Amino acid sequence: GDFVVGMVTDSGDIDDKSFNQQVWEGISRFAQENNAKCKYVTASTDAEYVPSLSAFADENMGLVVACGSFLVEAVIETSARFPKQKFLVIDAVVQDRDNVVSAVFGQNEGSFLVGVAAALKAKEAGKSAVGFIVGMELGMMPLFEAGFEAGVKAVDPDIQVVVEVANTFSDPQKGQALAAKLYDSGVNVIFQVAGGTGNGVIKEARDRRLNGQDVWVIGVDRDQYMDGVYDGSKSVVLTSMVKRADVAAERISKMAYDGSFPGGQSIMFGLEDKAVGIPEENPNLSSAVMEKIRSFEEKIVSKEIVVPVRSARMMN
Numbered sequence: 001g002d003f004v005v006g007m008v009t010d011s012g013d014i015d016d017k018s019f020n021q022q023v024w025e026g027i028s029r030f031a032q033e034n035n036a037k038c039k040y041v042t043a044s045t046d047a048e049y050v051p052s053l054s055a056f057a058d059e060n061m062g063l064v065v066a067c068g069s070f071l072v073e074a075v076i077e078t079s080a081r082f083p084k085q086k087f088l089v090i091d092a093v094v095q096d097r098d099n100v101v102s103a104v105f106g107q108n109e110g111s112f113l114v115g116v117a118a119a120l121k122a123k124e125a126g127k128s129a130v131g132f133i134v135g136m137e138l139g140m141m142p143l144f145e146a147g148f149e150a151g152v153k154a155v156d157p158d159i160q161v162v163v164e165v166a167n168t169f170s171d172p173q174k175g176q177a178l179a180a181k182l183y184d185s186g187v188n189v190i191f192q193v194a195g196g197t198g199n200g201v202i203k204e205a206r207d208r209r210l211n212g213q214d215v216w217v218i219g220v221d222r223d224q225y226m227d228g229v230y231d232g233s234k235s236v237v238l239t240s241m242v243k244r245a246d247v248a249a250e251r252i253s254k255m256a257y258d259g260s261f262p263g264g265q266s267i268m269f270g271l272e273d274k275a276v277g278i279p280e281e282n283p284n285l286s287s288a289v290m291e292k293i294r295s296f297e298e299k300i301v302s303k304e305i306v307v308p309v310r311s312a313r314m315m316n
């Protein structure tokens, strides 16, 4: 036998180049470094959710990881039935449950940083608009736009953010279509926050550049710089809003493994903890740009600047 961590996805697969991938990599590192084991199951439909989480709980594993906000209901109900099983919910808040720990991220703060990068790049071409494609808007998803918009405005209040919602994290065909719509309108920079769907946005940006259009995309979850290489050397990825869901998974799995599981707590992984932000190295960002970004970053961490949780269009 061994200590086992089981992961349940709510959409797409572990090869999504972003969110599911980060979570699985984290659980995988935990396992490999501690001689433990791990496995996962994919569940695209919500009627598949409770059955997936329950089978894992029934195997009495070390920790069941619910990857994504679509799983919150199934987890609240499943964890009710299986009080002796530990559950970790990634990307949504679950409190008042001793056997549930939830990890959320200060993605508004991280997104502020790539908004600064987006605005500076847009200004370079004399653009007064930048694009934003998000997979869904439920749960904590709005934090991305709220922060992206704040970062853009911190550079130039006259630059407008144009938003498209895909209503799915697993349709790259739709991501590509929404990206073409935005680029066709004149936008030269798009921040994609759409998981698997986002891979279609990155593909459109690569196709566009090859086609002679000076466009850019900003990645998410992972450092997606290499995914954007289009001519052998250069990349269309301006930078990425990295989100260490892998560290969160790895750390909480280790806590469960060691007997220090913080049940009943919803833990925030932020900019200060370096759980969100931009990659260490950014080939497409100048030193001047990096300078401005790090300056904002320090101010947000020190709380000299508080990043909003909802964008202007979503505030009363």
Ligand SMILES: Nc1ncnc2c1ncn2[C@@H]1O[C@H](CO)[C@@H](O)[C@H]1O
Residues within 6 Å of the ligand: 010, 011, 012, 018, 019, 020, 067, 068, 069, 070, 091, 135, 141, 169, 192, 193, 194, 195, 196, 198, 220, 221, 243
């Ligand atoms: N398969 C998914 N299920 C739930 N949320 C997702 C999924 N893929 C991406 N996301 C959300 O969109 C963001 C950018 O991909 C992620 O950090 C996460 O918040």
